[PDB]
Write a protein that binds this ligand. Structure first.
Ligand SMILES: OC[C@H]1O[C@@H](O)[C@H](O)[C@@H](O)[C@H]1O
Ligand SMILES: OC[C@H]1O[C@@H](O)[C@H](O)[C@@H](O)[C@H]1O
Ligand SMILES: OC[C@H]1O[C@H](O)[C@H](O)[C@@H](O)[C@@H]1O
Ligand SMILES: [Cl-]
Ligand SMILES: [Cl-]
Ligand SMILES: [Cl-]
Ligand SMILES: [Cl-]
Lengths: 731, 731
């Protein structure tokens, strides 16, 4: 057979450009690596825009004679090139798509010298460069690498296909790809239970499929296709799922039934480390998206992302939008050629993930460009008749070659501007935008963001308007049948170029911060889930008397699953239901507590003094939830929150750990400006500042495991707080 | 020749209450002192509500026989008592006023023990306690102590009258207060020179003095009176000035010439050390109003303050408004009694400061009290006819027993409450607020604060509004002649109780931070000075792109005293002046730059990249103020600016030292969350911790000098910043 085999241990990293054949000397690392570890805010950002060599050593194996030996690189940013005992074996410019390097014909006995060039700089013949970008690219080898040892005659990709997916007698078709002719053979699998099999050169088929269940956002049922080549014993497997995803102007319909998309954009970027984050860490994002913020769709801003991520979206029933790399700029016809190669490299790679339902074949917010775009549109339409074609824009009146008019609607809010008559309007009617009163399939890919930046620690009062603005929009969409869904700007706070942000190198556009800890808006999104799916009730305050203008906590937003919510404090008491008279169209509108339900006279015409409080949620009058606010919060618990207490002896893993400063009854302390000093022992490295600074009463950190067994042990100290510790076992 | 040694040293401090006879082991400490030293935020505030003790090692002298020995306690909080070798010479409850302890009798050869039981409990019987308060009282003998060996015949007090401040030849009337009837000699003098003398039975007059100066805000001329007793040889100095404060429905009058009053409110709360800070520091605060904020007035909120401050304001041309300790609450007979007693203690102490021009005899913002106030009112006026009187309120139609109707117009912004017609108003028409058909002296004493809170870290848009509102008030006040000027709430943010603030024990109301470092809205008071003193030009922005909703920094505020202002960026260039249309009545309306000066498309030039700017300021064609912002702020200089290079070798002095995280071209990094690891060697302790947090890009500390001489090496470091070292010499 074959032996696909990770090989991320034992790489030599060196700042610069070294003679490729002489044993390189430099620092020793395990992949994924990120060449230039950054601060959190206020940094150079070009620091990384330079040369870097990595190297690896591989001894001949008596076991490999006349078998191929290839390095699959899952990815590396950017302008890449590969050597083998000093001979160049692949140049691959794009820093998002993978590439193979064949070693065979330059391996000699004993150890051999594989060498790798990275130039991490904004090389305008490589997309997405040659102008500004509101996101950072970093550099290094930031994805996996795999030592494959393949037979001569062997198997390089397959497309699995689903004609009449909603037949009770389902159907499966496979197009293998190979290096010579010869019988190809294959096996449908559900767990270890063999469902079917066929045999043949060309398109293998299986039909009349009694007994299988459909992939969905509820039910992510996956199935597997083993492929063998009889005449060399090569074998491979591909997962896929049975599902339909139509974009008819009347709406979007999965598997027949219609479905309004809620959703958020996601970068693959972390603090300090950039894109050097592996299977686990990635697997998280997706999980948080689907569950925490309960979206039925993600979009990959503004490139292809990790296979690991896309795997995960498959496994948890989360829809996807996947876009070629770009950010509003087009270069010359050379670059257009380059750009049209990514389309190929992108779709070919991910034409089997059932999660992906649409493709992005426009550069982000670019002008029209008939002659180019014609190409990309043509190109996927052939590479994949199955998934619908789409692109992104922010002008109205565009040259829709694409199947679905996928716009960014930043109308909220321009009442604000001094020249504007348009009364504050959340989204536009579809034909203002589309330039055709002919109905067409229509989605909104981003909104808000730079329109209303909102920092972790921004005033109680601001973070209200912030949340409300996410509601106003979600409520716009769900109302209009014309609009298939929405997708807000954005999932978390990212590092950017100097050109954007608060000039701190941060766009503060998340609903969670950069650690994936949620700011108040997270429970607009997270709160549209059903109670069956989990029970949600956050009030949107810190229960501070004179934190707001004037003071008190009214009006009060409670974000929730529940019929009703109880205000209880100072002797005063009210039940209140969700505010349809302001948010008809939301699945789970939130509760507003108002003059309507209370006056300042009931609390008692500002009878000075501040009293603790108590909120409860209700579900067919069964007291489901309860959140308490002390009137005088003192530091009590210095929380230490690893996502997991247990992990395997795995080097790849990046462990996210959160930290909170909590008052008596549990709530976070939102304004303690301070730094938590921390230690970490046993088989992780911390990544970043040993001193960690709170924002919103909170921060987090990742711990790049060393791959060896042990217990990891973690202090966190601050002279207001009893001395905190936590541990997890490794192996 | 009296001996008046000054003995804040050699003291002993402990928690709880010993028998006042015997030895007491507690640490060798110095005064001013705070009993239990607090965090900057989120702490107990009941921490200091226990008994403590101060005992002293005092020696007899052969030098002292037939000569009264007396410790003078200049101020201490609270419920304070004295014992000499276990016998009790004085009770005083009230922790803002001075009180005397006569040991004389209770003395023996060798070493006599002196004790002080003090307790920081909010005793309901004791003004200022009862119920709630928006400030902390702390504990500690936070002020001075003096030892005084007196002749048995002696001068306890005197009062300096000044009829005809204005006449070309000037009287000085003197009314010494002496233990025994008998002769008293009075030499007026100019710091060095004589001017006249007089001996006297009874009342001492110095009529006819030609060629002396009026004391005014413009120029502070002081003169000292010197009192001898020939009988006992007792000697004391009293200092005063030659002024006239007329208050009239027409307006406030100083030496006849009219004056729109303009000022802010003030606490002795320091961060960490509470009330306990030394002369030098007390002075610096009087200094930072008058000189930086060009403020002609200050309100000692809410109690009497250090004579070290009150001296300072006589010295530097800063009028004063002082009042009895208190906060809305009114006690039983006992406590009201304690108050008229507190009026008495206050006037008697400060009847000779020219700076002071008005007495707050009403408990701050109480509801009216016929029986109780007619008392304080009537009382004060019998103690002091020379000056006028008001008492602070927030309620209308009020029993005006006072000379001046002192009002807290927080009208702005009340319409933000939904149950409100009234369209936005900065100040109420006097007519309505008094409910007195006749016009009467009106002064606005507080405004803003809790109406619009603003952390120093808070975002541009909020900051511009802070500023806006501050300006809006000042304008109105200058605009209406029935209003005799006004006073902003407040100078700096002050530590506080659980019923008030952001939950963190701060009320974020200062136009400066708690370290007397300016927020943007400090330059609204700063830019009212005539250029001919100094030149101020301060834009309001951080010059980051995505910081404000949408982006850019238009419209822009520049706060100035200049004919013109020239804005420059990416080849757009414009002269702009005072927006006088928006603030007709102001002295230095500021420059605003908006759509009327730079159009929509004219921004089109800029493309998508972000650009350096330069704001130049002008004065009669000459170019005065330049201000450079760049677009890619990096960590450049971590600044350490002490108040002073060179100093006295002096135990009392508390040196303020500021810190600043700075970019290339001068500017601060407003959203740079990081602690600065500090260290101090040289002859002084550091008040607060090693690690100080950059709030708003800045952060402050205070070093208490030891009394030793020499070289204070202070060090800041942080890893994004070049390590920095600053010195200050001591002698
Ligand atoms: O709201 C800010 C956003 O604007 C979008 O149009 C762009 O694609 C994003 O990366 C980000 O710049
Ligand atoms: O509500 C709290 C604040 O506002 C004023 O009404 C009061 O006089 C101030 O002392 C301050 O404490
Ligand atoms: O025990 C805590 C709670 O008890 C009481 O029910 C009070 O009404 C509530 O405000 C308080 O927080
Ligand atoms: Cl079959
Ligand atoms: Cl129409
Ligand atoms: Cl009486
Ligand atoms: Cl005087």
């Amino acid at each position: 057979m074959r032996v696909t085999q990770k090989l991320n241990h034992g790489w030599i990293f060196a700042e610069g450009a070294a003679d490729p054949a002489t044993p390189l000397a430099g620092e020793t690392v395990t992949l994924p690596h990120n060449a230039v570890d950054l601060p959190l805010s206020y940094f150079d950002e070009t620091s990384y825009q330079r040369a870097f060599t990595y190297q690896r050593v591989i001894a001949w194996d008596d076991a490999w004679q006349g078998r191929r030996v290839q390095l699959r690189f899952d990815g590396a940013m950017a302008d890449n090139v590969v050597w083998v005992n000093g001979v160049q074996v692949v140049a691959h410019p794009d820093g998002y798509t993978p590439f193979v390097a064949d070693l065979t014909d330059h391996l000699r006995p004993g150890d051999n010298l594989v060498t790798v060039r990275i130039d991490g700089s904004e090389n305008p013949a490589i997309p997405p460069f040659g102008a500004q970008i509101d996101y950072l690219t970093y550099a290094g080898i930031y994805r996996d690498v795999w030592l494959m040892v393949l037979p001569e005659r062997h198997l390089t990709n397959a497309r699995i296909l689903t004609p009449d997916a909603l037949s009770d007698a389902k159907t499966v078709v496979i197009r293998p790809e190979v290096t010579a002719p010869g019988p190809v053979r294959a096996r449908l699998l559900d767990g270890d239970r063999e469902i079917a099999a066929t045999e043949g050169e060309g398109e293998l088929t299986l039909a009349g499929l009694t007994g299988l269940s459909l992939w969905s956002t509820d039910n992510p049922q996956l199935y597997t296709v083993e492929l063998t080549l009889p005449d060399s014993g090569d074998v491979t497997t591909h997962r896929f799922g049975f599902r339909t995803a139509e974009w008819t102007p009347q709406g979007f319909l999965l598997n027949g039934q219609p479905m309004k998309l809620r959703g958020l954009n996601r970068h693959q970027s972390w603090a300090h480390q950039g894109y050097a984050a592996g299977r686990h860490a990635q697997e998280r994002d997706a999980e948080i998206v689907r569950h925490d913020l309960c979206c039925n769709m993600v979009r990959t801003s503004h490139y292809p992302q990790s296979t690991w991520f896309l795997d995960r979206c498959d496994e948890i029933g989360l829809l996807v939008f996947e876009e070629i790399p770009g950010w509003q700029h087009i270069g010359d016809q050379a670059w257009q050629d380059r750009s049209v190669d990514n389309v190929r490299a992108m779709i070919t790679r991910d034409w089997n993930h059932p999660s992906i339902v649409i493709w992005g074949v426009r550069i982000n917010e670019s002008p029209d460009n008939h002659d180019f775009y014609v190409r990309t549109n043509a190109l996927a339409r052939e590479l994949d008749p199955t998934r619908a074609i789409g692109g992104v824009r922010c002008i109205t009146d565009s040259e829709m070659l694409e199947d679905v008019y996928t716009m960014n609607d930043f109308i909220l809010d321009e009442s604000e501007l001094p020249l504007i008559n348009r009364p504050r309007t959340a989204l536009r009617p579809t034909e203002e935008v589309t330039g055709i009163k002919k109905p067409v399939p229509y989605l909104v890919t981003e909104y808000n963001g730079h329109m209303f930046p909102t920092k972790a620690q921004d005033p109680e009062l601001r973070q209200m308007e912030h949340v409300i603005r996410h509601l106003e929009v979600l409520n716009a969409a769900h109302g209009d049948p014309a609009i298939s869904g929405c997708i807000g700007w954005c999932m978390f706070d990212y590092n950017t170029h100097k050109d954007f942000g608060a000039g701190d190198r941060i766009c503060h556009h998340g609903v969670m911060d950069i650690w994936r800890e949620p700011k108040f808006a997270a429970h607009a999104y997270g709160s549209q889930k059903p109670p069956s799916e989990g029970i949600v009730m956050e009030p949107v305050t810190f229960w501070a008397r004179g934190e707001r203008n004037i003071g008190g906590v009214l009006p009060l937003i409670v974000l929730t699953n529940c019929d009703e919510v109880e205000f209880e404090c100072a002797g005063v008491t009210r039940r209140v239901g969700p505010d349809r008279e302001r948010f008809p169209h939301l699945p789970r509108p939130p509760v507003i507590i108002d003059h309507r339900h209370i006056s300042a006279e009931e609390l008692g015409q500002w009878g000075m003094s501040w009293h603790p409080g108590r909120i409860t949620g209700w579900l067919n009058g069964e007291q489901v939830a309860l959140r308490e606010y002390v009137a005088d919060p003192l530091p009590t618990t210095l929380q230490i929150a690893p996502d997991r207490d247990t992990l395997p002896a795995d080097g790849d893993i990046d462990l996210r750990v959160m930290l909170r400063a909590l008052d008596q009854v549990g709530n976070r302390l939102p304004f303690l400006d301070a730094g938590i000093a921390v230690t970490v022992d046993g088989p992780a490295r911390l990544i970043g500042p040993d001193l960690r600074m709170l924002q919103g009463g909170t921060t987090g950190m990742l711990l790049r495991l060393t791959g060896d067994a042990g217990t990891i042990r973690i202090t966190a100290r601050h002279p207001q707080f009893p001395e905190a510790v936590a541990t997890v076992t490794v192996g």
